[PDB]
Amino acid sequence: PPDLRPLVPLDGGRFATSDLNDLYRRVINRNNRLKRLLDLAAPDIIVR
Amino acid sequence: ETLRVDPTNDRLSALVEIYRMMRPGEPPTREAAESLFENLFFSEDRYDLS
Amino acid sequence: RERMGHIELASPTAHIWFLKSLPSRIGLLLDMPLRDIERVLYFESYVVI
Amino acid sequence: MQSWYLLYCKRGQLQRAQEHLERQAVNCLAPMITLEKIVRGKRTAVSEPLFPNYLFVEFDPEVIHTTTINATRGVSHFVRFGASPAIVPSAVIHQLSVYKP
RNA sequence: UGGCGGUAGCGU
DNA sequence: GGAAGATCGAAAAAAGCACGCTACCGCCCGCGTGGTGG
DNA sequence: CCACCACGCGGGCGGTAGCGTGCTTTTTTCGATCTTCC
User: Fold this and answer.
1) What's D90's DSSP letter?
2) I need a labelling partner for D57 at 20 to 30 A (CA). Which of A5, A32, D5, D86 fits?
3) Which long-range contacts (CB under 8 A, 24 or more apart) does D66-71 make?
4) Which residue from D15, D12, D52 is spatially nearest to D31, judged by alpha carbons?
């Protein structure tokens, strides 16, 4: 849940991103890239 | 005894073994191994005893 | 604070907790060494089904 | 003797890495796709590298070493499966060359 | 007014 | 007399390292791409 | 028409390589003997 990994305001127009948010972003980006490359009929080496 | 244990018997084999130990996962070539050995200790830029 | 999300993985991924925590549950269940499991998991060698 | 390798490049540095590899006298390959783009309202097609951040480099490890390719100021790393870098068969190279999706 | 990392200090 | 169980030491990987409290410092993503004003 | 105020996506960093480097205990694995037989 989001409150378990909150983004505390930094009173400077920015936010403090937690480690969990960074890891989730990495996982989501990797999954989206894999889906896009699978839909593009990528070669076996790139898919692996 | 150390000479007996050591399998290498030539400069090329010794350099290849040293390169494999230093940089595992790379193709061991004579030129790369000799470059690494000569740059590890006898190169001023990388090695410098104060 | 209680509602959770879910991500649909493009391909199945093994659980690291059930893999690296010695003894390897997957390796012990499959009667194969951990090295072979790591090799097949990280796309190093084919395994027959 | 000359063989093909797969290279993962840094973001937005595909052209710089390609030019650096060309300076090393090695063969470079990257798929090109023409896609209709805007760019401030002018209607043409831009070239986008299919399978982004991927390069196919034909060279000889004996002529020039692998780490030299790994440190061409713009190449992120090698696509290695195991200890040694992976080898892409020539059939895949031929497919990629003839394929024009 | 939330967290970490580093440094220094107090009581054992 | 070669193959499978024993074992044996040597090496490699994982985990732990007291309790409270106080003060200060530093940080809380970069870079090719795009629109707007001098 | 050119300088400069936003901006939204990947990943070690940076470099035509190499960086590590003063703990101890427990568990697992592996090469090497070995040894013991069928």
Assistant:
1) H
2) A32
3) D66/B26, D66/B27, D67/B23, D67/B26, D67/B32, D68/D24, D69/D5, D69/D7, D69/D21, D69/D24, D69/D26
4) D52
Technique of determination: cryo-EM
Count helices and strands (H / E) in chain A: 2, 2
Neighbours of chain A (3+ CB pairs under 8 A): C, D
Q: Measured at the alpha carbon of residue B5, what is the angle toward residues B3 and B7, in degrees to the nearest 5?
A: 85
For chain C, the three-class secondary structure string (H helix, E strand, C coil) is CCCCCCCCCCCCCCCCHHHHCCCCHHHHHCCCCHHHHHHHHCCCCCCCC
User: Which residues sit opposite D46 in a β-bridge?
Assistant: D35
Sign of the dihedral through C-alpha D61, D64, D66, D69: negative
C20 touches strand F (CB under 7 A): yes
Tokens of A40: 């593009």
D54: Cβ under 7 Å from strand G? Answer: no
- Rounded Cα gap, residues C34 and C27, in angstroms: 6
Question: Count of C–D CB contacts within 8 Å?
Answer: 5
Residue B24: both structure tokens together: 């595992």
With beta carbons less than 8 A apart as the criterion, state whether D63 and D3 touch: no
Chain B positions contacting chain D at CB under 8 Å are 23-27, 29, 31-32
In angstroms, this model's resolution equals 3.1
Chain A 7-46 residues whose Cβ is under 7 Å from strand E: 8-11, 16
Measured distance CA(C44)–CA(D82) in Å, rounded: 6
Q: How many CA atoms lie within 13 A of D1 on its CB side?
A: 5
Distance between CA atoms of residues C32 and D62, nearest Å: 38
